Amino acid sequence: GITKASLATESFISAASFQETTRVLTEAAVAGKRDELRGLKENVIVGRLI
């Protein structure tokens, strides 16, 4: 579905903006994830060019 497909994004800055922030932050923190801005939501929050 369109509601269980958006919960597969690979940029915790994106996924943490509309999902449960605590869960995304904890999962990203323990796994030591790197977010390399390559989306539109991410570069919008960070203030770069989409």
Partner 1 sequence: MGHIELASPTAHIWFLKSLPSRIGLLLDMPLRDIERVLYFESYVVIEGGM
Partner 2 sequence: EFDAIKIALASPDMIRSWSFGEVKKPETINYRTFKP
Partner 3 sequence: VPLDGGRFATSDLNDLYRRVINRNNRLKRLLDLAAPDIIVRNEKRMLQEAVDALLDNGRRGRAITGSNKRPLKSLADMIKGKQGRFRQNLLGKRVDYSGR
By CB under 8 A, name the one of 5, 34, 49, 50 that touches partner 2.
Answer: 34
What are the phi and psi torsion angles at 35 (to 5°)?
-105, 115
| 33 makes contact with partner 2 (CB under 8 A) | yes
**What distances in angstroms separate CA 8 from CA 12, 30, 47, 48, one per listed residue?**
10, 18, 23, 23
* Residue 11 or 16 having the CB closest to partner 3: 16
* Residue 1 or 32 having the CB closest to partner 2: 32
| 22 makes contact with partner 1 (CB under 8 A) | yes
In single-letter form, the type of residue at position 8 comes to A
